[PDB]
Design a protein around this ligand. Structure first.
Ligand SMILES: Nc1n[nH]c2cccc(Cl)c12
Ligand SMILES: Nc1n[nH]c2cccc(Cl)c12
Length: 339
């Protein structure tokens, strides 16, 4: 077995000459030379089987990424695992190798307005397809946007995804932890389980803001702080927007706050394209019902050089204990075995 940092990284003989890239959600990530297709590839080792939540996430991701086929969504090229359920301790997911990701780029590179436009276009193009399949990504953030040397962008990590369920979205105050904090819509903290498409649009808005300045727009220091940062920029919600929050704990919290004025986007982002700030405003709407949808966002003037709905495809086919989830992961990966 190939070894990387004294841990088994067992993918051979098809995949050789491994280099450590980083660590994924729970497991190691390497590049490797693919001896069939004669390209270097990315391979992430997942060791999920003792923890039901890693089993769940592994199976979601496998099921979704095997059904999806889109230029702006990472595929699965191959899956490696032992030939029997008994011997299977690890699963390796083989994907296109991408040079970098938007997290790494934003830490080091100023983006021209043309780069911001093209990246945002690709994000929304991929999102159109995901949403058209009635799926919510639910963890969109720069580190889940992979980029290659010619700035092609692919959305990755579908472990936290769900099927949309707008009729069952309502919940109480300060209960929910959907998404990564900086990219979490205000309603998550107030009255939303994150089961509507508007959750992803908020995250995209946050990413666009971050492309504009190389800094997260809402850098909450901890879970409770995240609302402070959102309201600090958007200002106090309107009466109409408060009237949409029927839950009393959530409503009365908001009513308890001193008035806060909106910070104008052109003061926060003085170098930004005015069309980009108009779209940003629309994606970072407090009220999720008023928030722009993915197809509207694509049709926005900022994206006019790229927009072409005939070239923005949709999905053809819209969408348990750990021992049964191992069996389902075994069944789902069977197509990649010699046979
Ligand atoms: N923790 C995880 N986040 N995203 C994943 C995708 C596949 C498998 C796992 Cl365990 C995860
Ligand atoms: N560099 C990468 N190319 N492709 C990937 C898929 C998942 C995780 C990573 Cl880090 C990569």
């Amino acid at each position: 077995p190939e070894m990387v940092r004294g841990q088994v990284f067992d993918v051979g003989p098809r995949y050789t000459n491994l280099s450590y890239i980083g660590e994924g959600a729970y497991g190691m990530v390497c590049s490797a030379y693919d001896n069939v297709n004669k390209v270097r590839v990315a391979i992430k080792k997942i060791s999920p089987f003792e923890h039901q939540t890693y089993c769940q996430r592994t199976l979601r991701e496998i099921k979704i990424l095997l059904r999806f086929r889109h230029e702006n969504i990472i595929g699965i090229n191959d899956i490696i695992r032992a030939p029997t359920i008994e011997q299977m301790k690890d699963v390796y997911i083989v994907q296109d190798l991408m040079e970098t990701d938007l997290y790494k780029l934003l830490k080091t590179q100023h983006l021209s307005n043309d780069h911001i436009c093209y990246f945002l276009y690709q994000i929304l193009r991929g999102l159109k397809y995901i949403h058209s399949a009635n799926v919510l990504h639910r963890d969109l953030k720069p580190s889940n946007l992979l980029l290659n040397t010619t700035c092609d962008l692919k959305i990755c990590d579908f472990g936290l995804a769900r099927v949309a369920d707008p009729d069952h979205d309502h919940t109480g105050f300060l209960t929910e932890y959907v998404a990564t904090r900086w990219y979490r819509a205000p309603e998550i903290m107030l009255n939303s389980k994150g089961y509507t498409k508007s959750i992803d649009i908020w995250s995209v808005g946050c990413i666009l803001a971050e492309m504009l300045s190389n800094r997260p727009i809402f850098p909450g220091k901890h879970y409770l702080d995240q609302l402070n940062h959102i309201l600090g920029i958007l200002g106090s919600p309107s009466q109409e927007d408060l009237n949409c929050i029927i839950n009393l704990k959530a409503r009365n919290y908001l009513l308890s706050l001193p008035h806060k004025n909106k910070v104008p986007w052109n003061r926060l982002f003085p170098n930004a394209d005015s069309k980009a700030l108009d779209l940003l405003d629309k994606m970072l709407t407090f009220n999720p019902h008023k928030r722009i949808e993915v197809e509207q966002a694509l049709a926005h003037p900022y994206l006019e050089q790229y927009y072409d709905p005939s070239d923005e495809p949709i999905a053809e086919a819209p969408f348990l204990p750990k021992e049964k989830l191992k069996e389902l992961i075994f069944e789902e990966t069977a197509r990649f075995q010699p046979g």
